[PDB]
Amino acid sequence: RKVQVSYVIRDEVEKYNRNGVNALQLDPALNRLFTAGRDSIIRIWSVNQHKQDPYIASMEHHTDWVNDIVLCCNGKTLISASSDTTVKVWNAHKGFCMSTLRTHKDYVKALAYAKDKELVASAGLDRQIFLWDVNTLTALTASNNTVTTSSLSGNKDSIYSLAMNQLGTIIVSGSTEKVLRVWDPRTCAKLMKLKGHTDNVKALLLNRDGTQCLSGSSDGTIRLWSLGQQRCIATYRVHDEGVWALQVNDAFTHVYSGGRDRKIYCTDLRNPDIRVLICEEKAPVLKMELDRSADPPPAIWVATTKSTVNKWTLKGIHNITPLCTQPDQVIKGGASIIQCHILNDKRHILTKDTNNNVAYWDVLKACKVEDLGKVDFEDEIKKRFKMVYVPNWFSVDLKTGMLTITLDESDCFAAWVSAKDAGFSSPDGSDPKLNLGGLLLQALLEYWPRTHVNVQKGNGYFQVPPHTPVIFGEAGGRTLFRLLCRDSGGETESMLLNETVPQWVIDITVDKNMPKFNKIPFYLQPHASDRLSASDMLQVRKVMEHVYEKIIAVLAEEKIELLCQDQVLDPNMDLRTVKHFIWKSGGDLTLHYRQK
Amino acid sequence: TVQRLLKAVQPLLKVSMSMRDCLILVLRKAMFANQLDARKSAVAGFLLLLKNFKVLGSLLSVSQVHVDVHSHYNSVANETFCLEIMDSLRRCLSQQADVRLMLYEGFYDVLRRNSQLANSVMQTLLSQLKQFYEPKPDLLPPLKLEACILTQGDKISLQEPLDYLLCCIQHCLAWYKNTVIPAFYEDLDDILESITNRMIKSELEDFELDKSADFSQSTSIGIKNNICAFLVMGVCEVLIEYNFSISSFSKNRFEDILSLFMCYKKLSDILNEKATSDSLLSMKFVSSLLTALFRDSIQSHQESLSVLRSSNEFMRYAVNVALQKVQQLKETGHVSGPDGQNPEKIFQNLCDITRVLLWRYTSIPTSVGKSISLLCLEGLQKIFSAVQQFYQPKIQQFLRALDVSVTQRTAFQIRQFQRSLLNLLSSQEEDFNSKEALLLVTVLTSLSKL
């Protein structure tokens, strides 16, 4: 395929989540809470009510939404599943990625864990379910890199949820087929299929010996299943909208439910009418993880689409109104950037975030310029207007909640501008022509030794911040290699770059080759009072002097006025912008010339 | 063809990681294959793969999938990888003579380009050489004559090219001592010195080759006795090259080298008339011998260098070796010895060879087998054509290096040859030396092409 380069404009440390949180895991031996951020970063928090700043560290390697996490091997290892189609294995104590599994071919949606076999399995939207012995994965090294798989078949559609029991003898999958499909993980033989539910199932739980199952569904019902009888023995319709998250106590007798309608209930399975409104959250509840230090659980952690994470206290079960009104602890979140406008100079960007704060950024220097506060966004757009046209040369996406800039071979080199119109002075008194994408490419790879020529480091006009992440991926999906700008001098990074950097980047960054120019054909005719062509950056003045000569500086400008579509042209305006902003007809641009 | 193909494809090998590991796996499988002539190509692959890359190597059933492990590379692991892949070559030194040849030729570049393996390559060479060199107070043929020859099926061939081995350890020790210092390398040069000081004292009957015993090209003992002369010939050449540079400038080393050349020349006279090979002098040493022998006139050297200058045959030998190197360059773009495949080093050395041969011919045509001056002029004739054929973009630099545009320089050179041609044509015939005039006309053609 075709390889794109991208990078994220951001600060070196994002202590707080910049987006919602998809999943949670609680380590009881160290009092550490893991959050799987939709902003692609996993963060570790301390739940000691002592410390005022619970943040400990970020583990950044993922490129997209982190959909599930499972703490394995008595808390040493966490495994995560992401929408970039990979599963990664991390050392949870030191916070670095050890291995990346790439056998999946689409978004990985759900992870499962069987403590008694120390077995995990992964499943996603690609309809595959792979089973992995965690100790085989941890035994992996750079020489012994071979891993072998075992997978289950039968699944006809995209998987959205998945649960295993503690003994690791039953595995159940949930999908848009609405039926939950069950296998024996020990033999991979397909077992019975229990049909009855009528919608997607995003939440699944099994009792310890895989004899009962709870399913939570977007149809709003909770259903309890006996696997020994293969039938539903109770159905609970306690929500108004889809149920997205389920938890259960150790005794398997009270179910905690939450979902799109923001309300969280505790319902007794033996006697439904005894039910407790636990709280109403501020945003749809996505996942919950009980602290299980003591039998009647003391608290429940709640993840939503918002960046804040609330701990709610549980006074007890014995006793319309919510039991609790304010969270007991609060881990603060940050704002997401939700709206973006590229200005006409094709160099600066205006943003709006979820807090209605407005900021101004410098794409070329990869940094923020000024906070503009809560001014009106569209009035700020209209106030910062300049009549200039520059061809599109990048694209922006907000999927991670940060500004991500993408460069593609098709248009990366399309934008030549003059040094004078840029913020780059003319220390020798003249301003030659710079290609923006080529300068950016040279700045991103400034620390790559192969671009250094016999000493120059970079391009001589600007640096990017050293911590900017630079990502090389294939268009449509598979990330190939990700590093930080400052790390390029390493021997491992340089080897992988040499193996991964596409020839179309090498052309600019290594050989120092100029990209192709672009010319504009145009007409000149006496309707103001011959078919020519020139550079798209040529100033009207140059055409005026041309005309002055062919029909014989200061005098030329004084005497000849140039016109287009009967509008008087600004002599400093270039042909490109005129064509974009004034030519409203079809076929080639037509200019009329006159003598005054 | 495997050597040429791998040399051609190595630019892709330089910038890749999957390809190098695939080639490493293929070569490793080829080494363990019991089919012979496969190892003959496996070692040829390994020398190229190892003498150009400082770090190499990485960082199946259907039911298995490769995964990426993000371990940053361990330098000690890679050094152990290199040490093992070189130990394999160390125990590959029990094969036929061609594998030994290419191994001896590649070890110098392996030492030069990967400095970490310095203290193991020399423990290979020094531990191999002692199979033949016989250390004692006095046993007159200090190198074992017959230990490198084999007798099976009455098809006598040599297995250990002792001359090439000694040349390789000579260059390795020179590079070790001269450059990369900032007691094995203290013992090795003492071994070399005890080879010289008991090889110049050989009666040449203690090699049992005193008189023209058999020397035939058809019989049984004859072919072996012929082959057992090129070994001592190459050993004498390489020992000349070393004993030039063991000490800077003293008369004792020069008595040594002159007497050893006499023992070379006696053998060459005996062997030549009855019925050859190339010489073993390194190209840079040939230049540094010619320049230091003709041009330089510092008074400190003169006492010692008068001994080496008084041997008329030595002059002819030196210029003949330089001419041989020029001829080898003319046929193919590589000279024999080290830096043979590096073109810029050959060009830089050839510049100095031209600069000194031009002086020798032009400065002293007093009264002019063949004389030295004719040999010099023939060298000029070969070397101008070599320059025009191969070093085409560097003609301007070549003419800048002799002692304005190219045409004035070339006009000056043509005038220089022109006056001598007139001088030797002005004589009445009486058997005028037409060879010099004929090849002068050839030089004028090859120069007026410019």
From Swiss-Prot, chain A:
Changing S158Y: Strongly reduces interaction with USP46 and abolishes stimulation of USP46 enzyme activity. InterPro entries: G-protein_beta_WD-40_rep (IPR020472), WD40/YVTN_repeat-like_dom_sf (IPR015943), WD40_repeat_CS (IPR019775), WD40_repeat_dom_sf (IPR036322), WD40_rpt (IPR001680), WDR48 (IPR051246), WDR48/Bun107 (IPR021772). Belongs to the WD repeat WDR48 family. Changing Y160A: Impaired binding to USP12. It comes from the Eukaryota. Changing R260D: Strongly reduces interaction with USP12 or USP46 and abolishes stimulation of their enzyme activity. Changing R260A: In UAF1(11A); impaired DNA-binding. In UAF1(11A); does not affect ability to promote USP1-mediated deubiquitination of FANCD2 and stimulate RAD51-mediated homologous recombination, because of DNA-binding mediated by RAD51AP1. Changing K156A: In UAF1(3A); impaired DNA-binding. In UAF1(3A); does not affect ability to promote USP1-mediated deubiquitination of FANCD2 and stimulate RAD51-mediated homologous recombination, because of DNA-binding mediated by RAD51AP1. GO terms for cellular component: cytoplasm; cytosol; intracellular membrane-bounded organelle; late endosome; lysosome; nucleoplasm; nucleus. Ubiquitous. The modification N6-acetyllysine is found at K202. The modification Phosphotyrosine is found at Y16. Knockdown of WDR48 increases Akt activation. It comes from Homo sapiens. Its main location: nucleus. N-terminal WD region interacts with TIP and C-terminal region mediates lysosomal localization. The WD repeats are required for the interaction with deubiquitinating enzymes USP1, USP12 and USP46. WD repeats lie at residues 16-55, 61-100, 103-142, 154-193, 196-235, 238-277, 280-319, 332-371. This is WD repeat-containing protein 48. Changing R18A: In UAF1(3A); impaired DNA-binding. In UAF1(3A); does not affect ability to promote USP1-mediated deubiquitination of FANCD2 and stimulate RAD51-mediated homologous recombination, because of DNA-binding mediated by RAD51AP1.
From Swiss-Prot, chain B:
Monoubiquitinated by FANCL on Lys-29 during S phase and upon genotoxic stress. Deubiquitinated by USP1 as cells enter G2/M, or once DNA repair is completed. Monoubiquitination requires the FANCA-FANCB-FANCC-FANCE-FANCF-FANCG-FANCM complex. Ubiquitination is required for binding to chromatin, DNA repair, and normal cell cycle progression. Monoubiquitination is stimulated by DNA-binding. Phosphorylated in response to DNA damage by ATM and/or ATR. Phosphorylation of FANCI promotes ubiquitination of FANCD2, which prevents DNA release from the FANCI-FANCD2 complex. The modification Phosphothreonine is found at T407. It is found in: Nucleus; Cytoplasm. There is a cross-link at K29 (Glycyl lysine isopeptide (Lys-Gly) (interchain with G-Cter in ubiquitin)). The C-terminal 30 residues are probably required for function in DNA repair. Belongs to the Fanconi anemia group I protein family. This is Fanconi anemia group I protein. It comes from Homo sapiens. The chain holds residues 495 to 995 of 1328 of the full protein.
